[PDB]
Amino acid sequence: SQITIQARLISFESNRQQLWKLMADLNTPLINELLCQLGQHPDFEKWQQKGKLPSTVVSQLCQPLKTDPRFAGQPSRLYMSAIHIVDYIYKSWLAIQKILLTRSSSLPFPLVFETNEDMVWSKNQKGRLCVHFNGLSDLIFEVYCGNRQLHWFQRFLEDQQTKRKSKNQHSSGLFTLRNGHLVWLEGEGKGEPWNLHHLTLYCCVDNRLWTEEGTEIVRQEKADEITKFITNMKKKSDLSDTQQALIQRKQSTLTRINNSFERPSQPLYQGQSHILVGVSLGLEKPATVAVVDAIANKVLAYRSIKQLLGDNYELLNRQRRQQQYLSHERHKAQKNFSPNQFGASELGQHIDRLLAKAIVALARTYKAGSIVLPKLGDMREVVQSEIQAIAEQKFPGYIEGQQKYAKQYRVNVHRWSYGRLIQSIQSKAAQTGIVIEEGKQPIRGSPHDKAKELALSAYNLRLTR
RNA sequence: AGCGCCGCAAUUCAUGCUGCUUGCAGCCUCUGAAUUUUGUUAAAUGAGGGUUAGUUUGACUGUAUAAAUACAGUCUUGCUUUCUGACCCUGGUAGCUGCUCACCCUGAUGCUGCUGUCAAUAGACAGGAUAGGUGCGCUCCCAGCAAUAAGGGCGCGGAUGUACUGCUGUAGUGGCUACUGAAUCACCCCCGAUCAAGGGGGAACCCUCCAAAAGGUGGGUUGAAAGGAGAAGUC
DNA sequence: GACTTCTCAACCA
DNA sequence: TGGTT
């Protein structure tokens, strides 16, 4: 729900063949037909015009009796997986447009487990943390993960054991694992697409559930949402012999949420409202950080892009060179060519993650519960209004010199992934416990002044509300 | 010459250091910032393609420390990525299949550019990435080609011709499929596995100890970092 | 390749 | 293993 981990799954050949023949021959045709029938179904204009869609129209388009001769021999959870995927696809598509869709790949569609369980674990004679699936209990796999993520799988197994020992008095809403994805991965070679295709499982986990105090905050979130749900729908709709069972089940979840788990106890990170960390993005320096406390109007510390990256500062120049080279070949090959997928490296993402981690670390060191960021939409102007301000520094009043230098500079220095940087800073701040706020970056001034004024303006906007 | 980056150096500061008054004073030592000029100063940046389930970036528990952190003991697994090294190769057999070409001017976000011997533009062989230029790189500059960016001139040989064509070969430059040539590594080597599986032998350095000097003992090390993944679209 | 949406069940049979 | 909200 907040973090995703992954691990390869290694198992019998018969198990792999059976799972593939169940996926690519019985499941993916099912998802494709569900998408096609949803597209062909009437009221599509009403759905798209109104936005969103009714909750159970895919399940009600199962009314053509999914159990057709072509779809026989499938566990129910896999039917639910097909329903999940199709509903998510159409939900996202109908939200995007404010038309028939297909699969944007050649590999079989993944398997989605919106439920916590259906991933019953084990530990074979050799000690490996194996896993099988609901309906596919005969399919015993073996988890191959990294030591950087092993403790999550062991937490999964031990949470399942904890609930089992108490005869199901620990709520499955506090389980660390939320969803699982059985995604087939591409494999270079030739042969059957289950000996030359690797299966990888993705576990969705909430990092707050690792500790105990975060488990309490998720507890209180669950309690508030459940109480609002029951007090909003119980009071009306006159219920029936079906949604009264839902009321009873939500009440049992509410009571089961309090019989908590023995959990690591790392105290919650509490910041200060006074201290805001403002990260001002720019074109010459892609990010500059200031740690300003607004009560005393002083600034604790400025950090340039070199200081944040430390021993990874060479990655910035590597990425700038790679961006220049990629843009050069993309323009050069735009003459109706088709070269390779050049620059497949995720170096930009790597530097983004390094910057986000360093910024969050600097936020923690000064105990700041608010990191201030600029809006993405505004940014398309700032990089346009900064380069010209650079030209006026070198050729003041020489307009032709301004344009020439601006063109050469834009050739040498491009925009640097200002969206993924904000996204990863948000991810790391949410993981640590730091609130991300939006500010108004001044279009004029040095990067340090821009960062300080960004954070100060964010605080001044906050004080009103 | 231009631009970007690296470092260097005198220059001014704090984001840094001291001092008590806890925001004021001075210094530049560490850490950094700022259009301040330089590149024999040692100086940091930078190499064409490919090679490891490769090592470290871990979790739990207990500690001093307000945390941040450092030590201790248990466990450990290999997923997806970014560097840093070292290594291997600058290919072969075939099939197919793109774009372009009468000739002449301008030359593009065009192509090519290493070393030493043979040799005629063209290439063979042995090496091989400190592969044209500045410290390094460029959509910049140099040289050659330029039909394979646009543009312009004028030929023949065909057209009922009014329309459009051929001047195209043992052509140039690319793409794909299948087979096999080398590396399948993280201090080095041999053996074996690649849906699991490690086992063994060695080299330098440091430490505990026996010590009687010498010699011997066991232990540890021989690069690190990051992650939220699926699915569908927008430019 | 850089942005834009959506999901991130929990008890009971 | 399988099921309604």
Full 3-state SS string of chain A: CCEEEEEEECCCHHHHHHHHHHHHHHHHHHHHHHHHHHHHCCCHHHHHHHCCCCCCHHHHCCCCCCCCHHHCCCCHHHHHHHHHHHHHHHHHHHHHCCCCCCCCCCCCCCCEECCCCCCCECCCCCCCCCECECCECCCCCCEECCCCCHHHHHHHHHHHHHHHHCCCCCCCCCCCEEEEEEEEECCCCCCCCCCCCEEEEEEEECHHHCCCHHHHHHHHHHHHHHHHHHHHHCCCCCCCCCHHHHHHHHHHHHHHCCCCCCCCCCCCCCCCCCEEEEEECCCCCCCEEEEEECCCCCEEEEECHHHHHHHHCHHHHHHHHHHHHHHHHHHHCCCCCCCCCCCCCCHHHHHHHHHHHHHHHHHHHCCCCEEEEECHHHHHHHHHHHHHHHHHHHCCCCHHHHHHHHHHHHHHCCCCCHHHHHHHHHHHHHHHCCEEEEECCCCCCCHHHHHHHHHHHHHHHHHHC
A148 touches strand B (CB under 7 A): yes
- Asked whether A307 and A336 are in contact (CB, 8 A), the reply is no
Q: Half-sphere exposure (CA, 13 Å, Cβ side) for A149?
A: 16
Residues A297 and A409 in one domain: yes
- Asked whether A459 and A440 are in contact (CB, 8 A), the reply is no
Of A residues 376-405, those with CB within 7 angstroms of nucleic strand C are 376-377
Which method, experimentally, gave rise to this model?
Answer: cryo-EM
Report residue A391 as tokens: 């030209």
For strand D, the positions having any atom within 7 A of a protein Cβ are: 1-5
CA gap A83, A378 in Å, rounded? 39
- Asked whether A20 and A101 are in contact (CB, 8 A), the reply is no
Residues A228 and A179 in one domain: no
Q: Which nucleotide is nearest to A102 (CA to C1')?
A: B232
A230-255: burial string, b at 16+ Cβ within 10 Å, e else: beeeeeeeeeeeeeeeeeeebeebbe
Report residue A57 as tokens: 């129209």
Which long-range contacts does A379-388 make (Cβ < 8 Å, 24+ apart)? A379/A281, A379/A418, A381/A443, A382/A281, A382/A282, A382/A283, A382/A441, A382/A443, A383/A282, A383/A283, A383/A415, A383/A418, A385/A443, A386/A282, A386/A283, A386/A284, A386/A443, A387/A283
Residues A194 and A227 in one domain: no
Are β-strands A198-205 and A3-9 bridged in parallel, bridged antiparallel, or unpaired? antiparallel
A325 within domain boundaries: no
Which residues have a Cβ under 8 Å from the Cβ of A283 and sit 6 or more positions away? Answer: A382, A383, A386, A387, A390, A413, A415, A416
Residues A111 and A247 in one domain: no
Of A residues 79-108, those with CB within 7 angstroms of nucleic strand D are 80
Residues A133 and A222 in one domain: no
Of A residues 263-322, those with CB within 7 angstroms of nucleic strand B are 264-266, 284-285, 299-304, 306-307, 312-315, 317-318, 320-321
A105 within domain boundaries: yes
A91 touches strand C (CB under 7 A): yes
Distance A54 CA to C10 C1' (A): 22
A67 touches strand C (CB under 7 A): no
A342 within domain boundaries: no
- Asked whether A185 and A200 are in contact (CB, 8 A), the reply is yes
Distance A188 CA to B203 C1' (A): 38
Q: Which nucleotide is nearest to A88 (CA to C1')?
A: C6
CA gap A114, A233 in Å, rounded? 23
Q: Which nucleotide is nearest to A173 (CA to C1')?
A: C10
Single residue among A208, A230, A247 that ends a domain in this structure: A208
A83 within domain boundaries: yes
A244 touches strand D (CB under 7 A): no
A60 touches strand D (CB under 7 A): no
- Kindly compute the dihedral angle of the four CA atoms of residues A186, A189, A191, A196, in this order, to the nearest 10 degrees: -40
**What CATH number should be reported for the domain holding residue A303?**
3.30.420
Nearest CA to A366 among A304, A275, A297? A275
Residue with tokens 């799954």: A9
Domain with A85 in it:
3-208
Residues A47 and A110 in one domain: yes
For strand B, the positions having any atom within 7 A of a protein Cβ are: 2-6, 14-16, 32-35, 45-47, 53, 57-61, 66-68, 76-83, 109-111, 137-139, 148-149, 176, 178-179, 195-197, 225-234
A337 within domain boundaries: no
Residues A55 and A174 in one domain: yes
CA gap A257, A163 in Å, rounded? 12
A149 touches strand B (CB under 7 A): yes
A63 touches strand D (CB under 7 A): no
Q: Which nucleotide is nearest to A177 (CA to C1')?
A: C8
CA gap A436, A233 in Å, rounded? 33
CA gap A318, A315 in Å, rounded? 5
- Bridge partners, residue A373, by sequence: A438
Distance A330 CA to B164 C1' (A): 36
Report residue A181 as tokens: 């994805």
Residues A92 and A61 in one domain: yes
Residues A372 and A241 in one domain: no
Angle at A251 between CA A246 and CA A257, to 5 degrees: 125
Residues A175 and A116 in one domain: yes
- Asked whether A374 and A439 are in contact (CB, 8 A), the reply is yes
A90 touches strand B (CB under 7 A): no
Distance A323 CA to B76 C1' (A): 39
Residues A243 and A291 in one domain: no
Distance A338 CA to B97 C1' (A): 15
Residues A203 and A217 in one domain: no
- Bridge partners, residue A144, by sequence: A8
For strand C, the positions having any atom within 7 A of a protein Cβ are: 1-12
What's the structural domain count of chain A?
3
Nearest CA to A432 among A374, A362, A375, A351? A362
Q: What is the resolution of this structure in A?
A: 3.0
A263 within domain boundaries: no
Report residue A304 as tokens: 């340039």
Distance A302 CA to B29 C1' (A): 22
Which residues have a Cβ under 8 Å from the Cβ of A18 and sit 6 or more positions away? Answer: A139
A56 within domain boundaries: yes
A335 within domain boundaries: no
Q: Which nucleotide is nearest to A311 (CA to C1')?
A: B225
Q: Which nucleotide is nearest to A332 (CA to C1')?
A: B109
A376 touches strand B (CB under 7 A): no
CA gap A462, A210 in Å, rounded? 31
